Amino acid sequence: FSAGRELRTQGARIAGVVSCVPSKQVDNDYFVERFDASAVRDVVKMIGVNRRRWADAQTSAGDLCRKAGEKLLAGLGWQADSIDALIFVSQTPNYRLPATAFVLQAELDLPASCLALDINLGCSGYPQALWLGMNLIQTGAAKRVLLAVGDTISKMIDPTDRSTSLLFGDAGTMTALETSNGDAAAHFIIGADGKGARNLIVPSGGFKPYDAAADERMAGKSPECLFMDGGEIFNFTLNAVPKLVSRTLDIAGRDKDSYDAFLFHQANLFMLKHLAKKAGLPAERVPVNIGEYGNTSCASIPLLITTELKDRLKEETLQLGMFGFGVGYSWASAALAVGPLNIVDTIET
Ligand SMILES: [Cl-]
């Protein structure tokens, strides 16, 4: 397990996925006054982002997940009393305490027997949420699980920082998991390297402020905002993720060309292109929606499913690989069959 823990589940399936994005659409024009048009043009070419959605002050990740959840439950026809666990994966919770999972439990009318867990993960979070939820179902702790995976990273961006300002958008998602009777297996790999903490971090805002003054890379940066060392993240990613993809493919037992899609965290288009090439993946089978939504952090994979795979999922079972990487450092994969599904949708606030 030198390159991550290998995990297998059976007896659980994805039953539906809904994404909810802010109705506020922010075009690149927005940024030309503060940043030079030429510089904006060159950066957005590389990152691939034409538009993104930004939450207003009264809209949180929890709110986006609640609205997605309402739509998902209505579509599935699942009664609130039937939900056994809700896991909220986010870096932008409502409160320091209580956890936002409790707010969602109450707002969705879930029962007292519904487990409520907030877990702090970023870009690597979706495959981990899938694994945890499917493990709960396999082990008989649950029959129906909701995964509320969302973020409003726009609220942590320094508006004077060009790289982060142009990159991030906001989204919230809800994924339904249910007990399944087939013999189909899901495979996951989950890895961590906390030595990367200082390369993707919000220095101030928690209970042990990072020593930003002592870090030359942070000169002129706001400590309450997101810091990213792009060069370090690129090198981390280009090394760890192709190995993750290879090993995931090997343990899932299916030929590369029999996958319907390889769903990557939408880090930036330059990175996505480099990863697909290094992993020898066919570019047409690597969906991208960063152009319309920006990088939506932990929401990026489920948002990709709803915006890019809705029509294909209606009709067939898809063989999917999912690869998340980022903050922690952390990286994670899922490889499994999904669908057909009728409840796959993208709504706005
Ligand atoms: Cl451009």
TrEMBL record:
Pfam families: ACP_syn_III, ACP_syn_III_C. Residues 117-194 form the Beta-ketoacyl-[acyl-carrier-protein] synthase III N-terminal domain. Its EC number is 2.3.1.41. GO terms for molecular function: 3-oxoacyl-[acyl-carrier-protein] synthase activity. Keywords: Acyltransferase, Transferase. The keyword Acyltransferase applies. InterPro entries: ACP_syn_III_C, ACP_syn_III_N, Thiolase-like. Residues 250-336 form the Beta-ketoacyl-[acyl-carrier-protein] synthase III C-terminal domain. The keyword Acyltransferase applies. One of its GO terms (biological process) is secondary metabolite biosynthetic process. This is 3-oxoacyl-(Acyl-carrier protein) synthase. It comes from Paraburkholderia xenovorans (strain LB400). The lineage of its organism: Bacteria, Pseudomonadati, Pseudomonadota, Betaproteobacteria, Burkholderiales.
